[PDB]
Ligand binder design. Structure first.
Ligand code: HEM
Ligand code: HEM
Ligand SMILES: CC(C)(C)OC(=O)N[C@H](CS[C@H](Cc1ccccc1)C(=O)NCCCc1ccncc1)Cc1ccccc1
Ligand SMILES: CC(C)(C)OC(=O)N[C@H](CS[C@H](Cc1ccccc1)C(=O)NCCCc1ccncc1)Cc1ccccc1
Lengths: 448, 448
């Protein structure tokens, strides 16, 4: 059917198989397939997720046109995701004017003024992260980073999104997901089954958690009325937000701020343990700005420059999105290249972050790439850990502030050393998520 | 799922059943269901074709806003039809800028200057219609109107669309369709199966005819290059038309000009036979304008006023579209009524044409409603046999000219009387097409 589009347009790419397209090349993950296609075919190439044509671009001027210049007009929505059910009103799922309305309603929620008000409350669970670390560290027992950071990320969420205060590591009925099973694999081969499962109410998000958070929010709403992100959205309610839409955005913010904050913190501490010099220099900067283990503030976090260099370099090596995608809604020609309607434009963030033509020794962990001297030579359309344009990461400021507050309190009291069971070097999962194959385990030693 | 929309909006309508919606009310046809809903619920009502909300409107100002004022912005496309395959490029199927491009490319094709050039060639098969009628009339054998008019309509088509000259009644491999089977009935209950059959290449139009017309056109193109509608589209080729798009429009024009011209001519001659006074007055006007059986011309057809009154009154009683539909693509509020996105706005043409509040004795056949005195009192948004707005019938001029040329030549030589087997009164098919239940049979007598 559509497997002759890139052939007609003169765009190179791997020859697709019937029905499957090029999905069999995903046997080593999205990352390895994007790196091989960038090496084999060059600046632009095309492939097929089954019958769906996917056009990959790597030109920074062409990336700017898709993500920024022609966002509202052509490249407004990501690829259609389903079955989603009521979560269609989710901001990361909504399309066209529905998204542009939800984006404006949730934009003042993620301002620096609202983020600074969260810091003193967020700084409470940094202490919870230390005392729980103190137990597992005081004993000579290696610590799984995904469990200790996953508990902290959930603690920040339940407090910053609903005011719920829980020590999740020691104490809550939020049930998890899975994101790499024969499921989506099949949905890619059979996208015609999406409207099938929608009328069956078969939601990729299991009803019982949505029902829980729906009734949990309505209990909080009518308890505060009359007598966090929830209150910022209650005060917000472009006709005002709906109750079913409000819980849907929470459900996004529950997953976004949880799994992504836990993974990056695990990737950062893996690099700090395998690079003791970077860990020591970061501890010296934290001690210089915050002497006597001073509690970090919103202003002191933005003052640490080497801390920002460590976070940015880690996101370069591990961009958890991997790819940035937009759906071409109208026949357009950008930067001298015609793009038909319906083609999914893709930006290989992982491949561009490790491109030797833009980075010297791209596989190495060198925070000095993001120094105040060298940060000017970084193209913001090649280094996109938070995307770019009107539909970039809306929680970029919150995520960078949440991770740095955790790193400061953790490095103020502990040093992290590799173990025997520590996977060195870290091998990324061959699946569809940017996560370690084996969980990162490290030895935690107290600075006292 | 969606069965609580009209309840939330305060819009009356029949209570829908799960999955089915209100499709079980179609057991007596679209026409009877639209008349009952207009009587029970009033000016506006809503129902569900399965899970699809359909909002019906009858206000002429509100109909003008949907069909004309907000056509390009909101109400641009009809309800999604499939599986269609390559016929997606069909003008009556295309959507948004693809349709607006095809509409502009095919608009000069249907001008009065191009229609007048077709008349002397079209007038050839009016004589074929008489001599073939002369055989079946010279013998005392009643004649089925759908067979004699269906042959004439196909004769005009193959000549005006490809230059092919055939006496189809006596002499062509165009295979037919069916439009009311458990098929669409099921597609309405299960619209999620449309993308299923699309990837299977299961086309509602069977491949072998499309393959025939595709290769037949390419034989005609390269025979005229270098040494009708086809040539008007060849000369036309908004980037120029495609070869696969060109045959697709022909396929539309094959069905549109065939079944619709045969049905209306059968409805007109049924009324003329059951109303001998109208038939005599029409014969007197034709003889006055064209004495001695003068061949009709483009200018003489527009000169006959009582002929236009007969055609317009018949289209009032039998509007073959029955309904006019538009898909609401954006949340809008027109004439003080909010319409959500995705709702199919429907205009019950059959119910409005037989509304006693707009027509005196609506069931009766009275051509005097369209006299030059009374035609001014007719609201063009209540009487819509050809629709209204930018997406109205593009072949309205050709259809009115083709039917009148047939009626003139037929009434110049023959008089039509009812038989014993003639269904009086004519009962419309309880299906989804505006067609007679039993075929119209009449006695044909020569005026000589
Ligand atoms: C290290 C942490 C994070 C990284 C690297 C990250 C990165 C990204 C990226 C690359 C995108 C897509 C941008 C695009 O398509 O142009 C995105 C979207 C998004 N992110 Fe984040 N993110 C992080 C954490 C968070 C957090 C804490 C939130 C909290 C609300 C969040 C909320 C969102 C939302 C709602 C979207 C979709 C925005 C839209 O569709 O308009 N993310 N993120
Ligand atoms: C008695 C004869 C005919 C009647 C009563 C009739 C009526 C109609 C109506 C009511 C519509 C829909 C208008 C709307 O949705 O607003 C339509 C559409 C259309 N008709 Fe006709 N029609 C007739 C014959 C023809 C003929 C001879 C052609 C030859 C090409 C034709 C071509 C079309 C096309 C292409 C469309 C779709 C236009 C678009 O989607 O932009 N029709 N017709
Ligand atoms: C991975 C794959 C390619 C298969 O599909 C997607 O990517 N999933 C999303 C759409 S489902 C999900 C909803 C949800 C809610 C509650 C629990 C579970 C799931 C969501 O909304 N976000 C999940 C990504 C995590 C993230 C969020 C923000 N920031 C950074 C990372 C679309 C998307 C596309 C590009 C970037 C981010 C999200
Ligand atoms: C009836 C139903 C509600 C189920 O679906 C539609 O209505 N079918 C069309 C879309 S399929 C068809 C394509 C085709 C081509 C070759 C052979 C067979 C079929 C088409 O293009 N036309 C067919 C109507 C005849 C007509 C054409 C012009 N003028 C007047 C009448 C959409 C449509 C909607 C409103 C009015 C007209 C057409």
């Amino acid at each position: 059917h559509s497997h002759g589009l890139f052939k007609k347009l003169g765009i190179p790419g791997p020859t697709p198989l019937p029905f499957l397209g090029n999905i069999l090349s995903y046997h080593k993950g999205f990352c390895m397939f994007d790196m091989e296609c960038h090496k084999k075919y060059g600046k632009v190439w095309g492939f097929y997720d089954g019958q769906q044509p996917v056009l990959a671009i790597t030109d920074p001027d062409m990336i700017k046109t898709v993500l920024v210049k022609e966002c509202y007009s052509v490249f407004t929505n990501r690829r259609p995701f389903g079955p989603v059910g009521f979560m269609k009103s989710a901001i990361s799922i909504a399309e066209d004017e529905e998204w542009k309305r939800l984006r404006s309603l949730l934009s003042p929620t993620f301002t620096s003024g609202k983020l600074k008000e969260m810091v003193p409350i967020i700084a409470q669970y940094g202490d919870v992260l230390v005392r729980n670390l103190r137990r597992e560290a005081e004993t000579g027992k290696p610590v799984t980073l995904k469990d200790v950071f996953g508990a902290y990320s959930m603690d920040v969420i339940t407090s910053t999104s609903f005011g719920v205060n829980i020590d999740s590591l020691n104490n809550k009925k939020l049930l998890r997901f899975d994101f790499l099973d024969p499921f989506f694999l099949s949905i890619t081969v059979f996208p015609f089954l999406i409207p099938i499962l929608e009328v069956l109410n078969i939601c990729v998000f299991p009803r019982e958690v949505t029902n829980f958070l729906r009734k949990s929010v309505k209990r909080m709403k009518e308890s505060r009325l009359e007598d966090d992100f929830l209150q910022l959205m209650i005060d917000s309610q472009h006709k005002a937000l709906s109750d079913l839409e409000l819980v849907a955005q929470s459900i996004i913010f529950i997953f976004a701020g949880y799994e992504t904050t836990s993974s990056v913190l695990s990737f950062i501490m893996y690099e700090l343990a395998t690079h003791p010099d970077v860990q020591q220099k970061l501890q010296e900067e934290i001690d210089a700005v915050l002497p006597n283990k001073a509690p970090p503030t919103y202003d002191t976090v933005l003052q640490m420059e080497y801390l920002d260099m460590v976070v940015n370099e880690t996101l370069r090596l591990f961009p958890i999105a991997m790819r940035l995608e937009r759906v071409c809604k109208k026949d357009v020609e950008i930067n001298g290249m015609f793009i038909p309607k319906g083609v999914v434009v893709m930006i290989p963030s992982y491949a561009l972050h490790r491109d030797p033509k833009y980075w010297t020794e791209p596989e190495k962990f060198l925070p000095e790439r993001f120094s105040k001297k060298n940060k000017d030579n970084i193209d913001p359309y090649i280094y996109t850990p938070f995307g770019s344009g009107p539909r970039n990461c809306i929680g970029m400021r919150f995520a960078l502030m949440n991770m740095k507050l955790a790193l400061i309190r953790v490095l103020q009291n502990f040093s992290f050393k590799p173990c025997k069971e520590t996977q060195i070097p870290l091998k990324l999962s061959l699946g569809g998520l940017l996560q370690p194959e084996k969980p990162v385990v490290l030895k935690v030693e107290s600075r006292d």
